[PDB]
Symmetry: C7
Subunit: 277 residues, 7 copies
Amino acid sequence: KSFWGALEDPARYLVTFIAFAQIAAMVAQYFSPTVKGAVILSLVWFLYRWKTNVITRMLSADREKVLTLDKVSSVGLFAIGLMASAEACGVAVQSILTVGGVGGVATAFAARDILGNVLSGLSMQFSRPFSMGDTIKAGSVEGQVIEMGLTTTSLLNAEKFPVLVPNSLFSSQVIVNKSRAQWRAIASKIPLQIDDLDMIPQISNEIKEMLRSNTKVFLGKEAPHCYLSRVEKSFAELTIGCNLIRMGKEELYNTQQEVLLEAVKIIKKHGVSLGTT
Amino acid sequence: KSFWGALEDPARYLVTFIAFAQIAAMVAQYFSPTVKGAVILSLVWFLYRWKTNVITRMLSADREKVLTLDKVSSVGLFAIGLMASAEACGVAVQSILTVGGVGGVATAFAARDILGNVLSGLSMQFSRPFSMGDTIKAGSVEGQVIEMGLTTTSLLNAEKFPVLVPNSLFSSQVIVNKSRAQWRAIASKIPLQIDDLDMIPQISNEIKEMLRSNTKVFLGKEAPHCYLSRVEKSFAELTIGCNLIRMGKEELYNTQQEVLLEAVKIIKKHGVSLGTT
Amino acid sequence: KSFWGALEDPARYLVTFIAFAQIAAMVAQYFSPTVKGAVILSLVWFLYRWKTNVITRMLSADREKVLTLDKVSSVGLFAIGLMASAEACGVAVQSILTVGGVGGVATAFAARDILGNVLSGLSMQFSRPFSMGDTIKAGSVEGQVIEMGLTTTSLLNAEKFPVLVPNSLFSSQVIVNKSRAQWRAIASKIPLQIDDLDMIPQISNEIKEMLRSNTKVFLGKEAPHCYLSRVEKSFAELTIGCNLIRMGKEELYNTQQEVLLEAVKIIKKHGVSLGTT
Amino acid sequence: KSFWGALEDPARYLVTFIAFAQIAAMVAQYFSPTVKGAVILSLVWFLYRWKTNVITRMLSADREKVLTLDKVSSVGLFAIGLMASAEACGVAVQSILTVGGVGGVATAFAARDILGNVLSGLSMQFSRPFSMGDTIKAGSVEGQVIEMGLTTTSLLNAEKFPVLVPNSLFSSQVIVNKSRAQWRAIASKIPLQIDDLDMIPQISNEIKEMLRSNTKVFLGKEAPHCYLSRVEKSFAELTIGCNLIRMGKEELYNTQQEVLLEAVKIIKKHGVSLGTT
Amino acid sequence: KSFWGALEDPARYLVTFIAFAQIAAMVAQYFSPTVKGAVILSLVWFLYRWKTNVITRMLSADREKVLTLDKVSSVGLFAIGLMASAEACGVAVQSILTVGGVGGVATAFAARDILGNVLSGLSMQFSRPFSMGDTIKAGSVEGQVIEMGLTTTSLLNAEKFPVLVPNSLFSSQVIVNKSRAQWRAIASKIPLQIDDLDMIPQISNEIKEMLRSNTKVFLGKEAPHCYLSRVEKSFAELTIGCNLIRMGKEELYNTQQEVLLEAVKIIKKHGVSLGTT
Amino acid sequence: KSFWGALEDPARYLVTFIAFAQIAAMVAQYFSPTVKGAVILSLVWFLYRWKTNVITRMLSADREKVLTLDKVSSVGLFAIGLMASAEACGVAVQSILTVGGVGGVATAFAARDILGNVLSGLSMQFSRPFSMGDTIKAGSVEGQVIEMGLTTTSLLNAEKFPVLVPNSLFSSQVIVNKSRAQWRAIASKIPLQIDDLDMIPQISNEIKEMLRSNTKVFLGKEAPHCYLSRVEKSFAELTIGCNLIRMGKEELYNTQQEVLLEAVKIIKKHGVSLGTT
Amino acid sequence: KSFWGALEDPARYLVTFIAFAQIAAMVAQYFSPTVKGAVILSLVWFLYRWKTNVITRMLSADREKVLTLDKVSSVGLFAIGLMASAEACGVAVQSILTVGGVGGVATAFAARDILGNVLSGLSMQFSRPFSMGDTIKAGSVEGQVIEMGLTTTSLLNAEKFPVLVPNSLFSSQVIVNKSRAQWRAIASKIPLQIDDLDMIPQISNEIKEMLRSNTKVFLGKEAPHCYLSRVEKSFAELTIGCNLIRMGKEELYNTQQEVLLEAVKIIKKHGVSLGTT
């Protein structure tokens, strides 16, 4: 019915058997082998009793999970009981133990991925690299964290599909956390159709002035830049960039578009025109 | 005929032999080695009897499977019986045990893929990452789940061919579940042949208005966007995008086409024309 | 001459020697070491006798195979006999056993590919992923199965060359079975030179009607689609697709060509013309 | 309450039990097995007492970390206590020890990444390859170091997102330290539309003169170069380059732009014009 | 001088020593350790004698090979003799045996490639995937087999250079045998500049007729095909293909050229012209 | 204070204890276990004393290094002392030894990279593949050697940044030494716009003459070449090349430019003009 | 001074000590442990004496090599002596032996690359795949062999730089030997601007005639070919090829150029002109 009976029955059988053997030998002397064999077999029987009670208790309340647990536990208990009984009796100890050891190492390397996922889930439970809702990028996958488990994490990627990442990928690869950034950084390239480069400095400086006179820029770390990155026949390329304050994602788009339009306005104000890549 | 006879014949032979040896020694004292050897050899004979009964019982009802099982089980039983008998007799114990151990580890690493498939099938039976009929994408393969087994999963890919994925690929790679998405997300890029960028804001805003005034859009998480992503000589690129409600797959196509046509209509309404990439 | 003589010569020599030793000790007491040494050496001699009889029997009927088997078996038997004799005598047991164990693990990892091929051949004999004549695609190779063995499969690829695939590639990679598909799926893209997109809906719908009014289409799972996938200056791209009934391979080509010609006919009927990618 | 009580309670119980057993045997002689069993069980109980005191002491002041530590430590202590008690009693020693050993090697290979990160963090604590604030580039990631830990380093990449690099990547890959450079090096390519190559030497020399007559160049290691790297119909390519003094990052951009404009000025002074790649 | 002397010198020394020790102990009793030590040391001396005789016999007839064999065999014999003598004497048995075991496993993993080549050479000696003269393609290499060895195969590649392929590449990769094909297969693509697609069927059918009315085609497996694979503005692409009888390599070229010219003739007969990709 | 006291305190305690036990047993006989336990515990205490003296001596003169060494050494000493004391007492020997062994192999595989770097640093100390100042190229990195250590080498790459290469990369990859070359080799390709190829020989020969009549060419190994590598409509490509004497890096550039200009001069002298790729 | 003294000092000390102990026990009986300890410690001292003599002898004649050898040998000897002395005394045998074994396997896997290089150098000393001066191509590297060692080979690549290839790359990869070819093979492609393909056969045949009437062609294996590989609007591509006799490298260039010019001459003789790819 419970653990109490599942113990009491084998315990009373074992005490009965050892008390029988004691007065079977007192009034040919292999008390130790038989007593150890009885202890091993009774303990195996008690473990079987407890296992059946528990997964019968679990099915008296997620059901094929209970059947899989029952089958796997019966396999494991049969293996352990066979090894321990062959060692208690003394018949073919090293042979059966070697078989069991090579089976154990087969199973232990075959299960390196499940164990990796579990151990990496725990390691992530210690050094939290992200939290629920953060937009992360792990190797090839990227999206919003929607579930954190012990063997897998669940993301929502750019097409808004739920992705399932095994937790052993967060220990061997770098993790980008797009939700903990305190300032953003934009950079673009504008092509110019220009032959009189004598006004590439002026334009450049003016643009930088515009980027410092713009709200939503961050002048704390790096200054806005706009330099000539390559030249060619009636062609030039300006590389613009700046840092922006911590903003949303529609405001980032609006600021990018606004900076680009103001830059092209400054460029066309000096009589220059855009080039063709 | 059954397990009962397959046991009683060796059990009665063993009891006969040990009862013979007892009164062969009472009225030179190696009772333990001979008795352990008899137990080992009788147990091997009983296992052979039971194996033959079972795969003769299985062939008295998927036939080359039974022959393969018979051959593999005979190989394994010969190995185990040789090891155990050499250990019971005492002749070249460690030599034969070392040979058997290196053979076991050869077989145990050679079989890492079959064991990986089985263990990953069980792990998937616990944490179900998909179900029958779901459209998944696992690494390089993608399609509709049509069969779930213990060592392989079966998909139907985009050309409508049945693919057979070993289950050890669902533990080391990310799984995208296209059938559990609750809203979709579309994004496109429109090129414009424009020289007066002074109307890129207006157009943009108008398009966004259109995407919010459209049924089948999802305004719960992110707002529709339409920003200028790159500019060039008489050329510009608008990046449009939005989220859509949970819809089928022909309605997704229809909505994409409709959004694209309405956007081009708004663009041409402002006197702008499409560009050429 | 046979197994009978190959056994009764060493068996009679061993019985003679142990009967000699018994009355050599009865009328200095190392009966056990000498008897175990005699058993080991006689058993090694009997195994040599049986091996020579068998591969002499095999060469009295595929000949360099027999010579290779003879050489490999003599190597293995020399190794096993040396280990067992050094353990029976008692001279340098652990040294020679360690040498033999490191040689065994060298050979057991050096042979991981042959063992992988054999074990994967058996695993495929259980869960048959294809049969003789099927057109499969395994990773980088594809063709018609023309032979199925235990360590290799033989295909006929697209250039009609016989390919030899090691069977350990069918356990770590996905297998596409092009011969078990129950319906096909075609998809194409048509470019249009169009400036009045006001007739992209009509055309689209008409094409879909054509794909549903065509025999050899499969309306069981997905509906035919034809949507606008990208637009550009006097340019548009229609993505067409449908499912087809289970057909041959020349009928699939004919149906593709027919669908393409009918689609272009519908397109040109509305005054539109094809574009240039 | 503390370690003192957590020790004295089991120590006094053990001393009581061994003093009982001594006069239980003096006035059947298995003093050693029972005494060793009592020592093992008392030590396991004391370790449990100390563990509960410590992680109860830690929760009487970063809380789910304490719960995870408690669970992991209870798992480990149960494993160790089971092994040691089965070895003290003598029941199924080698079986349980083999099970525990294969479980230990499973866990020890499953945890190769966490251990790699920790050991590489220590190795980096010895041979410091960078410090806080340095701009490093490790394999595929690059940015400013913002945090240095034992199992992970934190960077700020080019988009100004915090990246989390596992410390086992700094032992197998090269690390570029962009903050310890003492002089910079610029190099560019200018295309020329030229048919009279008889003035490619002159131009070249003049440009080099310009690069040596420029402040912010470093003439300590290598001389400025400007050579003809490829020629073609009315086309040529000059490869320019030099070293610059240790400067900031906006001054590097300004110097690049200035050198490029001066070079194009020299080129156009000789009647040559820029070409088109 | 020979094996006879190399044995009867150590054998007579050993018999002399054991006969001395027997009457040294009969008229302090460590007969077994000294006798086993004498047997081990005499056997090591005999092995040294035999090794020197053999590689002196081999150098009395490919010479640096003999010197390398001598050095390697002396290294191995020193290792084995040191282990066995330390185990016979009894001084630091487990220490020296552990050193020797870790050295053996170092050497056994360092030599995984040589052993792989040898074992794969034997496996290829059983399942012959090609023979001398066959044109094979193994992974990245392709050419005519000009030599087959035990650790390497020799090919002649397309530039007519001798390539040396390690035999462990024929067990992990697929092998294409270009010399066992029984029929060939050609396929080509012809671009057409056509606006009236109303004659794409006719042309197609005619071409197929031409491919069936041609000798050197194989109508046993698949029928000749010619279908429209893609269309575009005044552009179309016909995909032609067929099987050819088993022919040489200059006849294959001639047949390809002939089929291509006849197809273009049929195409231009219908007033169509070739297009431009 | 020193090693002398750190030894003579535990040595005198141990001698006192064994002299006590001797006359505690002479006037119940477990002299060996208690004496071995005392030796082990005294030796552990002495090692602790010596460790504390040394890293207190090192901190009485590169400080966090000393703290890390102290912590790591205390961890290691606790592990070793626990193992040795549990083995001396006799309580749970095999259990604790198995735990320690699996921990040791965990740490020994987790530290394969640090050990690889150290062993490869030593191997490089024997077979010196470069020296300080040499310009090397190792796999993906290239630059001037600026520091050679035991676990890492330091380079200065093309952008003049200090790179830190782990020394385990110089044992698995090829190393190019750009500072030990004794002659250089240049090769270029010139396109020609030519329709009368009847003067491609002449030009070619003339160019070769020019390359042999030029100082700074090396006529010791290979002769200068200039051949026609591909032809096309009014287009041809000449592939030129030669060896140059051992020269600097600005002279190599000057020689390349000079050879290119002289070749184009010879080409235009024959009425040919350059083509357009 | 030499090996003689380095042996006769420890040998005389050991004989003195055992002769002392014998009459210390004759007129408490632990002769075996003390004698084995004395033998082990004397042997360790003798090995230290011999090591110091040898590397003092080597430094009395490539010097930092001797210091590295001295340090490494002292480390190894300390390890071996500690293990053997702890095993002779009997204090913490299995603990120290386990520590030493895990250290040995750490070092034995950390040194897999050095051992691979050495073993592959020996394997190459047996099956010589090239000799000094041969032009080989191993994987990604190619050049002339300029030095052959035991752990590395030295090449001279195409830029005439000395490359250093680890010898473990010649066992896992294919080796192309450009210096053992007996005939060469050239192949080229000529584009034609042709609309009347009725003269593609004639031209083709004529070209082949030219390739058979040319000296320096090899008509032993394959016949010269020239076939039409692809056609297009006013465009065709002829694929030419042949085998050439064993020639140098400037004669190969001359023959290529000559064949190309003669082919273009034949092509233009038939009124055809070259096309434009």
